[PDB]
Amino acid sequence: TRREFDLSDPLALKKDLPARQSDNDVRNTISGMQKFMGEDLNFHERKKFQEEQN
Amino acid sequence: MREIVHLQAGQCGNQIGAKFWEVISDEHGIDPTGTYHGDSDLQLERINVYYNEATGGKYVPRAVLVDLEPGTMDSVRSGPFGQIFRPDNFVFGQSGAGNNWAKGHYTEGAELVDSVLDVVRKEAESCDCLQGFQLTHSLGGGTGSGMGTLLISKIREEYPDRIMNTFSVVPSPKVSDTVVEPYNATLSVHQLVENTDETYCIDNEALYDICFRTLKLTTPTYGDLNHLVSATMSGVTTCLRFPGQLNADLRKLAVNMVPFPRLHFFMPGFAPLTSRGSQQYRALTVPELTQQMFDAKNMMAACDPRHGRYLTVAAVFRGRMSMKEVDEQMLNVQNKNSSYFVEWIPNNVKTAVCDIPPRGLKMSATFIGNSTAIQELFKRISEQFTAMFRRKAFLHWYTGEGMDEMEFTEAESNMNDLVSEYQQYQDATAEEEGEF
Amino acid sequence: MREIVHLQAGQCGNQIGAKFWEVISDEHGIDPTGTYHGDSDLQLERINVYYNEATGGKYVPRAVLVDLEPGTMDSVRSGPFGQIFRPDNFVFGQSGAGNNWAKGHYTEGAELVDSVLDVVRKEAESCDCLQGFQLTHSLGGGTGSGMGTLLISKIREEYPDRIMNTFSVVPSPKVSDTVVEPYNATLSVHQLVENTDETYCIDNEALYDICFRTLKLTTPTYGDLNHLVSATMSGVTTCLRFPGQLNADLRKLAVNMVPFPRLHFFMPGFAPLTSRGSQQYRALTVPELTQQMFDAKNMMAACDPRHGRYLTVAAVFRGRMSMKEVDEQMLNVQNKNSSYFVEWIPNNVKTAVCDIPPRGLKMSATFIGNSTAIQELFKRISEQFTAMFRRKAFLHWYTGEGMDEMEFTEAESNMNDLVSEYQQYQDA
Amino acid sequence: MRECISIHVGQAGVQIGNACWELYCLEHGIQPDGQMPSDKTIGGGDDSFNTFFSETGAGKHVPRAVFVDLEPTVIDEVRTGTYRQLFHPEQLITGKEDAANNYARGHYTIGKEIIDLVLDRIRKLADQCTGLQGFLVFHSFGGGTGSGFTSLLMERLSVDYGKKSKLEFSIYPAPQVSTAVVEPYNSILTTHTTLEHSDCAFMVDNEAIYDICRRNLDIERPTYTNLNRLIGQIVSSITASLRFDGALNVDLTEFQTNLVPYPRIHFPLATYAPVISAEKAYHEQLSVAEITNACFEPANQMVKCDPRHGKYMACCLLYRGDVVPKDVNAAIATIKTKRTIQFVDWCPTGFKVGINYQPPTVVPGGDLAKVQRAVCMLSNTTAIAEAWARLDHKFDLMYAKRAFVHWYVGEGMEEGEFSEAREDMAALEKDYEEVGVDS
Amino acid sequence: SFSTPVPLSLGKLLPYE
Ligand SMILES: Nc1nc2c(ncn2[C@@H]2O[C@H](COP(=O)(O)OP(=O)(O)OP(=O)(O)O)[C@@H](O)[C@H]2O)c(=O)[nH]1
Ligand SMILES: Nc1nc2c(ncn2[C@@H]2O[C@H](COP(=O)(O)OP(=O)(O)O)[C@@H](O)[C@H]2O)c(=O)[nH]1
Ligand SMILES: Nc1nc2c(ncn2[C@@H]2O[C@H](COP(=O)(O)OP(=O)(O)O)[C@@H](O)[C@H]2O)c(=O)[nH]1
């Protein structure tokens, strides 16, 4: 109950979040640079469909 | 109140600029239609830096987009975030430059600059107190380096007491995709060294290298490469738009970096970049930012600072954070790496802290590094230009447009004077005074 | 505070480290996911000695894994405790050595050290006060011996005023499963004697002899062998993590066990080893630990101190216990056998006591011994090396990769001088 | 009466002035709206706030402060924050396009621009003062506005007012850590023009208060908002003799005479004790001898310099709270008999004592404890010559081949101003040793 | 549609219109 306590909290590293808990994170947007477009999450499905098409 | 007028030149500039306006509209909470949909009240306190008020509570960017081929202008119009731009600012020609620096600087681009400078003057005079300009372009093309350097020369004569940034995409040896890159490069470096206040060297090898071994990214598309470029260019001017404990805009950064007006080629770098499989194994703490900012992996040029000496450096931090660690960690890397830092200047690290973090992150940082190791790129451009100009290869594409052969010779002498100028400062005795 | 950086080299180094991180995560109460799930507060008091802090109250080990073949790396990551390691700590090369010391030390290991020295400097500067390093490697293969000696040779000048331990899998005459194995052993002991604070000799003959005679297990897999050796490796750094009535860190052991700088070859043992049939019938008593330890069968090397002289002796005990019986029994074993100790060093015994026992056990002991009997081992390696080098056997795999003939000559002469130095304390 | 006008200039000025004026309102019972509670408003309501707060017939109490800055991103936090309705809207002066860490920019081009407006507000605030003790100036050496604008602020203030008291609360550059690069250029050029136009200049640097907060307050990473609270505590102890009574009274013009013995030496050091944690106050009783030996201790010095390397020249002690005059002098006599502390030979008496009755007040969310007694010390020491010797080292090693001079010559000063500033300081360095040699 | 000038253009549909 002292001001600016979160800077000196011993358990601050315990009460924190990694900012990529799941791929469906509402707070991860384009300005936050932890989500990228090139992560082909449908890469293997696209490859299987390409094989079927061929 | 402190306005930055944005300048985009070439196809590469428009891809970078489109992502840049997307990344900071999200930061300020702007929908693609143009209105404001946010949750905080300090996002509109300083928004006239990049945006211009329109009717009905609509914000339009202070950007002008310039190209010599109309194919890119429709793509940047009909893109994901192309609706917010005013259609007047899209200025374009009908015949392309053709990957030729002479067409963009002497013949084709000499008629397009009359329309561009009227729009630039119209948009810069509307500011109550203009802060400076900012340009994004690539040196490997014809309409970005041929005509972008002409825009450099006209603006500097018209507005001398202003500060100008440029974001030059320096060409690369290993992933070069154009044969006449050293022709377009060495004829433009002379224009950037004489008439530009700050220059940032952004290289496609380092963008590919960061996207491969750091992000562990599968397909590094040009949108992902421009995602990193828009990171530092959003973060370098975050003290202008958001309040902080230690504020430093780009003019105060310019004073503390440039010791002599011929030494303004810097290296950018974004600190908090993690992969998907390693983010939840890493704690976000100020030493973790400083370690990931200073290693040679995250440098956004093809320069290894181990070969050179760090001349003067920056760190611009973001987030609510206690700056003992900011004042301690860069002192620790100052005392340890005694050889990398030049002893001719003491405590060369410049520090700024911004309170407002990027959206979704609690802590972030940005790096600007002036090093003597930048001279290896100009030497590589010199040797590739020397080996081909000596045989007069591809010369009729350039000498048929009016420029004589002595412009190449003076372009060699200006760059060889530049690489020697960095060499004296790298090996100089501090504890001595000369004839002066 | 005082932090230990772990190193693993080769397939044997990876297997011995996976079991070691398996047994001390259970000692400190760590689930396979990584989150702390304990029952006391003394476990959480000293975690930074081996673990780092991560987001969400996770702990990742301060360890780096080094290999030249990705086949063993995949099995380690797919094991029960493979999720706890950071993926950046795994360093692998795409072309192995192939039981060859020259590939690991000159050609192939030269390119891979730039990444390892990048990673090990990356996390050792994060220590507020680095206590020391630790290495586990095998001399029977060139993946962890050719480069394992080069990692030692590069870290010494970089961090001079530190302490480093190595656990060398010294090769055996009967479990000799590679032909060029004397070349790998001899050329690595030369590098080991000059750049190492503390060395340990672990032999698979003794591990097989223990599991046959004592544990009575029908199938001694390598997991049982890794259990036996890591029960000693956890047992040597207990004073750093768990407080005791008399503490002794790794530097306090080294100053009382290394009288001369070339004499640092120690051979270990573990006292409370019992079969399941004999588990019901033993009595947990203080003289039972020292009587089951000073038995010559219980040692973890292919040598007998009965042939030699106990130069210095250290004992580390685990468990809340009375120390008068500790001082009484160790004086009793020192005085009853007056011929196995040197005359010129009275009080050859270093003693330490830790309160917290190993999990599931009441009392335990760990013993470190410097003796002259190690020169029997070194002569056995050297006699096979000189019986096969003198006909230039297998020399085209070494002289054609950037090695002249003088490295083999100086490796024999340095080993000849080392056994002569060890021999002079057997008599004088 | 008993009025003094405080001017906060630069980013360091307004950030210190935020925590300093927060302490003043709580100490006098002022909310951020500005009206005293009706239980404490009588026609005989105590007029102790006239040293700082003015009076309005409605009941408002406007502070007598001037906030000067050249960048509006730090004054907008004041205009929007909790004390929005307290400060006068015209007393928060701001500009545009700042100074960009430059002495020449803040002295010649941008600084001369905004000095007619500031001096107008000074006249409007000094015309209400029946008896004016002097001006207090809060600034930093490193910054462009704190170096450039304050350099000609004293030039015009000496023209406008002849012999009035002018006190400095200046952030000296730390010998190790600094946020700038051209900071040694600013520090030479500031002191060169401040030497003949400043009456006294208190000395603090950030890293020496950083070590105090780490060890003596049980916090491992403070920031600027809890670093300005200690500076606000020191300036509270200086002016508490005017505001409240005591056994001994000390005005602004007392320690100016008692600490500056020569025209070129007006750089004392400000230390405070006891700075203790609230958990730690359970075990430590604070006697008069206990709190005055902590002031003399070099660990609690608020300037990174060791007084053992030099000689003391003058001291000033300001006691607050429950103290008796006997315990002060028994403790002072104990100090004089110790051989670690050394005085110069021509100063057989180097002390001055002030006694205040009111204990220091506590702020919610603060770091310090609620104590019974405290003492702050203003001591002038010969051992600050090493600070100039190191700072002349950083200037000469940077000016060795004319680095960062084109950012100064092209702004409006000639090249010769660098040569007359260090020659003034090199004479000042020879001046410090000439005083310190015993007869 | 966006790239053609105002002369030399058929009546087309501009983007976002
Ligand atoms: N002790 C302390 N020092 C501060 C504080 N704020 C700023 N500083 C010091 O001020 C220096 C930075 O220069 P400033 O005074 O902030 O710069 P400025 O007055 O705004 O002038 P310009 O930025 O050049 O326009 C840093 O080196 C800090 O040491 C503070 O709140 N407390
Ligand atoms: N980093 C980055 N580089 C790009 C992008 N688009 C093109 N380039 C590079 O620019 C080079 C070609 O530039 P070019 O289009 O001819 O420039 P222009 O003629 O002035 O428009 C290629 O080698 C690309 O690698 C982009 O979006 N980001
Ligand atoms: N004690 C023990 N010895 C092992 C283990 N794994 C392998 N070895 C021994 O190490 C030798 C082969 O080691 P090798 O895989 O070639 O080591 P590397 O070349 O460094 O990868 C064999 O003779 C085994 O007896 C183990 O887990 N424990």
Ligand SMILES: [Mg+2]
């Ligand atoms: Mg400022």
